[PDB]
Amino acid sequence: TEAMIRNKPGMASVKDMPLLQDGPPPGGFAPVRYARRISNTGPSAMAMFLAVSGAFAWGMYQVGQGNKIRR
Amino acid sequence: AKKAREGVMEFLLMNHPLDCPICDQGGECDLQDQSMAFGSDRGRFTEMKRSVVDKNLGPLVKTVMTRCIQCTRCVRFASEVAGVQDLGILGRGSGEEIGTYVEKLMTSELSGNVIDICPVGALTSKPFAFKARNWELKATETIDVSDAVG
Numbered sequence: 001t002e003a004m005i006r007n008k009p010g011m012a013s014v015k016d017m018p019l020l021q022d023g024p025p026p027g028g029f030a031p032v033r034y035a036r037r038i039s040n041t042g043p044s045a046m047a048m049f050l051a052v053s054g055a056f057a058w059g060m061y062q063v064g065q066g067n068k069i070r071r
Numbered sequence: 072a073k074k075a076r077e078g079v080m081e082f083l084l085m086n087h088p089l090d091c092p093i094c095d096q097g098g099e100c101d102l103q104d105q106s107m108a109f110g111s112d113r114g115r116f117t118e119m120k121r122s123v124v125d126k127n128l129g130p131l132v133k134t135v136m137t138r139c140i141q142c143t144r145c146v147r148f149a150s151e152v153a154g155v156q157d158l159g160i161l162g163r164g165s166g167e168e169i170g171t172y173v174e175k176l177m178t179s180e181l182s183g184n185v186i187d188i189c190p191v192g193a194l195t196s197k198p199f200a201f202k203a204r205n206w207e208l209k210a211t212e213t214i215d216v217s218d219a220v221g
């Protein structure tokens with residue numbers, strides 16, 4: 001058998017049997033990423049301290065002015 | 072020697088029907104255990120196997136002569152040990168058919184042992200029609216008490 005299970009009309013020979021099974025497409029798949037691409041594009045060490053400290057300087061001035069208005 | 076054995080076990084399994092699942096002697100088979108041990112793993116015969124009608128050999132020996140390989144063991148057992156001379160190898164070639172040429176129940180006692188003689192399911196106990204399998208049966212080496220031969 002095995003030439004009556006995989007017919008492929010013609011083929012003249014036991015080789016050239018159909019042989020259609022699963023696999024990667026011709027040319028493989030896309031290059032798959034595996035590294036750790038963690039983007040560190042956030043606020044830096046400064047700009048975070050200077051945003052906080054700018055607030056505990058202007059916002060505290062505003063607390064002061066609000067205390068003046070309340071008084 | 073091994074190539075000769077594989078050759079012959081291919082011929083035997085060539086015109087032999089795929090009756091192993093429905094064969095009563097499926098597990099306890101010389102043909103299955105010689106093919107799975109000395110015969111080739113594959114068969115190149117992809118054509119029309121020969122088939123043979125089932126002879127009526129009585130209420131003891133269920134007969135499926137298509138499975139039978141025409142090794143002649145039973146037709147010798149009935150002629151010699153059983154001594155009744157009813158079985159025969161009728162015909163020649165692949166058309167060879169083992170059994171009585173006229174419908175003739177094996178009137179001889181001692182002719183139920185042809186099933187153990189038979190290396191193939193073909194001749195099987197009709198009482199033990201299909202009720203069990205060669206692996207389920209737990210065997211005890213008992214004796215017999217029907218007749219005083221023990």
Ligand code: SF4
Binds near residue numbers: 096138
């Ligand atoms: S005798 Fe029965 S079990 Fe053994 S190979 Fe033939 S069909 Fe299969």
Ligand code: SF4
Binds near residue numbers: 138193
């Ligand atoms: S013993 Fe069984 S296999 Fe051998 S010739 Fe007789 S019926 Fe056929």
